[PDB]
Amino acid sequence: MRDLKTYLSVAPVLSTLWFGALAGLLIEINRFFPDALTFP
Amino acid sequence: TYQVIQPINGDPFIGSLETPITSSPLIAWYLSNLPGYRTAVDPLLRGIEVGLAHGYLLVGPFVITGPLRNAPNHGAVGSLGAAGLIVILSITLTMYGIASFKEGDPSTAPSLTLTGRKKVPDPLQTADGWARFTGGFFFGGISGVIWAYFLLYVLDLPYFVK
Amino acid sequence: TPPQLDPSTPSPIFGGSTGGLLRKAQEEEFYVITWESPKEQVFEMPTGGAAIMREGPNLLKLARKEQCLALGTRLRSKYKINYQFYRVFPNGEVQYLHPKDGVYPEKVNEGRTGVGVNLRSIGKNVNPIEVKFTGKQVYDL
Amino acid sequence: VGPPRGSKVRILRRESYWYKGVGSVVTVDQDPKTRYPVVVRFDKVNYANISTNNYALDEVEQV
Amino acid sequence: NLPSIFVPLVGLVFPAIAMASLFLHVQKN
Amino acid sequence: SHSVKIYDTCIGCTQCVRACPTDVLEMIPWDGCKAKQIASAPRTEDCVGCKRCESACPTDFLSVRVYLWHETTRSMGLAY
Amino acid sequence: SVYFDLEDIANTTGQWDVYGSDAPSPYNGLQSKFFETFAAPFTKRGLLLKFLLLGGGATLAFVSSQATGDDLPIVKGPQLPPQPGPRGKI
Amino acid sequence: DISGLTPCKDSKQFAKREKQQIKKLESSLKLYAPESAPALALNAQIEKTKRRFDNYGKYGLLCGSDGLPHLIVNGDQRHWGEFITPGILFLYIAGWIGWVGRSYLIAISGEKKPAMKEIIIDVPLASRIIFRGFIWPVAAYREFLNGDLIAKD
Amino acid sequence: EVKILVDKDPVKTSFEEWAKPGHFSRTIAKGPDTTTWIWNLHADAHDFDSHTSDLEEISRKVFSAHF
Ligand code: CLA
Ligand code: CLA
Ligand code: CLA
Ligand code: CLA
Ligand SMILES: CC1=C(/C=C/C(C)=C/C=C/C(C)=C\C=C\C=C(C)\C=C\C=C(C)\C=C\C2=C(C)CCCC2(C)C)C(C)(C)CCC1
Ligand SMILES: CCCCCCCS[C@@H]1O[C@H](CO)[C@@H](O)[C@H](O)[C@H]1O
Ligand SMILES: CCCCCCCS[C@@H]1O[C@H](CO)[C@@H](O)[C@H](O)[C@H]1O
Ligand SMILES: CCCCCCCS[C@@H]1O[C@H](CO)[C@@H](O)[C@H](O)[C@H]1O
Ligand code: SF4
Ligand code: SF4
């Protein structure tokens, strides 16, 4: 349990989780606010 | 059992091996009877033979594959090209001889046979010997080119490919 | 130590290879490594392949000093055999090389004098302009 | 002779990997014939993965 | 007139003479 | 022949000598280090310049330095 | 049993003449006399190099200068009216 | 307008581009039943294009002689929404990231083997640090005055 | 004779070695000092004969990797 939490804190796993969350956020923003060239 | 491949001359620490390609009696005799390995005879005659063979062999490609191959003058043009190649080869031989051999130095050829018997080293590896060899080569090559031309386009013998 | 001379000892059993001596040994130099073995055994050759070292004295001729030293270190590490090697010239002159003092060079020994020792740190070498138009290098000073 | 053992020292050798850095003195040789007596240990490894080096008495500054 | 003579000289004969001389120079001693 | 030089930052652990592929270096008595020995290069005519000694050098900076110099048949590692 | 002798370095290092033959001349005497007589001028290496280079250069220049339009298209020259340029240039 | 450009609500090339895009989309509509799902998907694309062009008209962008929007960066007060405001937002996010990274690197520096917290991240410590970037300009300024920002070597 | 030959419970199933990167080799298991370590971990991941000198131990590893 402790060892598995230590493994999930390793660089590649944390990196893929973080970038997946970022990609999902950006994708949803672009889905609901598409084609933004300026900032109104 | 019975192995065929042996170390060269019985010495396992010389960088070669004895194989049927290199040490069979037929190939050994054939190589020993070529003009390039006739140690005890004037290099001029050996060069004559070598040039006679090579200039004769050089005529065909120039005559048949050349730019003017389809012209009625193809034979003479190809023979002239072969003669020019022989001249260039003689120039290269003279250059190598001048660069490699000094007039006073003795021969660089080995003085032992395969059986360890002392022999006279080849005079071809001297300045005078090489000069005689290249002169003979030039004279033989020009004559061979002329002979091939005479056989092909002066007597017009029914050769299949001309 | 008084260096040992070169007898006519036998050579390891080998079938021959294309990696042996060339004409450089005829005109420039070659090298000879001699050792003593307690038994006949297999050893890899530095020129390729495997040879049989005989019990008693063993003599082997090679093209380079590096080949002789590589074979020697392999003998010392694997078979625990002491070795020597010499440089032989076309005129029959033999020059003893290693072990030079009778002691291997990694072990300190009296009677040796330093060659190429600089009594300064590597950072105290002078700049090139100080040796410009002279034939000397900065590390030779 | 030398900085006290366990102190923090700045390196003044120009060619050293830890030039102008800080290390810890482990031992100092007391033999007067020793050219570089001060043994220093560093936190970072050099390009040869080595963390210890010997320095002379004038290449080390007590900080 | 001139090109038919000069082109073989500059393109073939002069390079050959220069190469022979330079080779004999670099093979000296 | 290449140039091999030894500086007094030597600690005398004999690492260079046993890394030499052509037996160029050796160890000689000294008094400037605790080991009471320093390296020397009396046979630089057999040097090939592979710089294996510098890879075994623990001192910072290197105590053995190899400078590539005029090339001979021995220094280029030619067996032909 | 041994292949290392200090008195015979040539045998030790393999300085052998493998295919060299010491047999006498296999050529006929009259033919050898003829070739010796008529190839003697070409046995001077200093003379041969100069003669070959200079005579070959002169022969090459002469042959190039005697070539006709049938042998070389460059000697024949153009036979067709010239093409015009992209935008009327000549 | 600026640099000889005309607003995209006036330029005829912009409207011509919008008409041609819709015509290109409507040619593939002919190959499907009027009630099919691909017909419903191309219609959504047509509405998306109409909305895009209408938005580009409304925001007040300048278009060249090609019918395409052109950005104005020099600093004009009526074109701040193309470079200035997005740039400020980017500079706020990037400074946030940099400051959170710097604080985490400082927090693990004084340990036995601090290279293990750089490959295995102390997630609770990162959670503590992360939300300090919301006020990163204030702290970054304040360590500039005191002198805790720059190492004086 | 040809027969099935197995060993029971040779390696314990635990998450403890997941939390120790580079456990498979002596040098890498000590942790990183430079960035080279990060690459060395991935280049030697499947070099089983460099991890151990036991032929049986290597063979079991390749057998499971195939699965
Ligand atoms: C076009 C190239 C060519 C050709 C056709 C010949 C032809 C000939 N040469 Mg010659 N030669 C050449 C180049 C050539 N040479 C060059 C470049 C040199 C300078 C080193 C010489 C130097 C030379 C000397 C010094 C002598 C000859 C001699 C001879 C004749 C005897 C041939 C012989 O015994 O071969 C023997 C060939 C070898 C020992 C070479 C080894 C052959 C290997 C094992 C395999 C052959 C490869 C194979 C044929 C390739 C085909 C495969 C391909 C289609 C993929 C023969 C007319 C002799 C002569 O004049 O006799 C009257 C003679 O004494 N040559
Ligand atoms: C400026 C440089 C130059 C020049 C002027 C030439 C000129 C020529 N080349 Mg050539 N060539 C060159 C560079 C050059 N080459 C290079 C760099 C390459 C390598 C890519 C080639 C490869 C090449 C090929 C592969 C061929 C030519 C051929 C030819 C000839 C074509 C004309 C023809 O159809 O008559 C044909 C006329 C003959 C065959 C009779 C020529 C008889 C000559 C004039 C006798 C005189 C030779 C002389 C004694 C030797 C002097 C050597 C010198 C060192 C002193 C012509 C003489 C063709 C040819 O047939 O030439 C052999 C041919 O097949 N060339
Ligand atoms: C703590 C993170 C951090 C910070 C504060 C900086 C800060 C800086 N870097 Mg830098 N860098 C970083 C990480 C960081 N870097 C990483 C990870 C790399 C390897 C890819 C580099 C590679 C790099 C180069 C090659 C250069 C800089 C340069 C610079 C300086 C100019 C700004 C710049 O060019 O940014 C550009 C930054 C990058 C290209 C890398 C950004 C990588 C991400 C965004 C950082 C992520 C950090 C970490 C994963 C998050 C921490 C999480 C934690 C809370 C658990 C500036 C001092 C330049 C310089 O020295 O000029 C003055 C320069 O040439 N950096
Ligand atoms: C079934 C086939 C097979 C097997 C079991 C092995 C097994 C092995 N090989 Mg091997 N190899 C193979 C095929 C195979 N190889 C082939 C086909 C080649 C020729 C290309 C090689 C070339 C090769 C070399 C040159 C070396 C090995 C080595 C090794 C050993 C270490 C492997 C390791 O740790 O890699 C760890 C794995 C990685 C570091 C991952 C690399 C990722 C690659 C480069 C990316 C591939 C691109 C990808 C398809 C596209 C993705 C796009 C991206 C944007 C996501 C191991 C015993 C090494 C060794 O020391 O052996 C003892 C060694 O030096 N092999
Ligand atoms: C107005 C304008 C403009 C201009 C601009 C400019 C000109 C700018 C400049 C700028 C500059 C000239 C700058 C400088 C700077 C310097 C320095 C020196 C800096 C530094 C920085 C730093 C130091 C940072 C740090 C940090 C932080 C704080 C955060 C993150 C992390 C870190 C730590 C990195 C333009 C036209 C474009 C457009 C319009 C607007
Ligand atoms: C969302 C914030 C809290 C997330 C906590 C995830 C596990 S926290 C995790 O704990 C391990 C020990 O079990 C440590 O070794 C490791 O450094 C640490 O990141
Ligand atoms: C340093 C950049 C050049 C500084 C230019 C000063 C503002 S210039 C200013 O710009 C306004 C729009 O922003 C216009 O409405 C106004 O007519 C004009 O005078
Ligand atoms: C080096 C050339 C200039 C580089 C300018 C990089 C930012 S370019 C900038 O990026 C923003 C991101 O959303 C866009 O909204 C905006 O339209 C665009 O002008
Ligand atoms: S160069 Fe190669 S051989 Fe010469 S000393 Fe340094 S390491 Fe030994
Ligand atoms: S390696 Fe460094 S320390 Fe070891 S001997 Fe050579 S110089 Fe002296």
TrEMBL record, chain E:
User: One GO cellular component from the entry?
Assistant: photosystem I
**Predominant location:** plastid
- GO-annotated biological processes: photosynthesis
Q: Which domain of life is it from?
A: Eukaryota
Q: Which residues cross the membrane?
A: 2-24
Q: Topology in the membrane?
A: Single-pass membrane protein
Tell me the keywords, alphabetical order: Chloroplast, Membrane, Photosynthesis, Photosystem I, Plastid, Thylakoid, Transmembrane, Transmembrane helix
Q: Where in the cell is it found?
A: Plastid, Chloroplast thylakoid membrane
- Similarity-based family: Belongs to the PsaI family.
Q: What does this protein do?
A: May help in the organization of the PsaL subunit.
Q: What is this protein called?
A: Photosystem I reaction center subunit VIII
> What is the organism field in this record?
Ruellia brittoniana
From TrEMBL, chain I:
Question: Record's superkingdom?
Answer: Eukaryota
Write out the residues that bind chlorophyll a 2.
Answer: H46
Q: Which cell locations does it reside in?
A: Membrane; Plastid, Chloroplast thylakoid membrane
Residues that bind chlorophyll a 1: H23, K61
Q: What does the UniProt record say this protein does?
A: PsaA and PsaB bind P700, the primary electron donor of photosystem I (PSI), as well as the electron acceptors A0, A1 and FX. PSI is a plastocyanin-ferredoxin oxidoreductase, converting photonic excitation into a charge separation, which transfers an electron from the donor P700 chlorophyll pair to the spectroscopically characterized acceptors A0, A1, FX, FA and FB in turn. Oxidized P700 is reduced on the lumenal side of the thylakoid membrane by plastocyanin.
* UniProt record similarity statement: Belongs to the PsaA/PsaB family.
Summarize the subunit comment.
Answer: The PsaA/B heterodimer binds the P700 chlorophyll special pair and subsequent electron acceptors. PSI consists of a core antenna complex that captures photons, and an electron transfer chain that converts photonic excitation into a charge separation. The eukaryotic PSI reaction center is composed of at least 11 subunits.
Q: What is this protein called?
A: Photosystem I P700 chlorophyll a apoprotein A1
- Which species? Pseuderanthemum haikangense
Q: Span within the entire protein?
A: 9 to 75 of 750
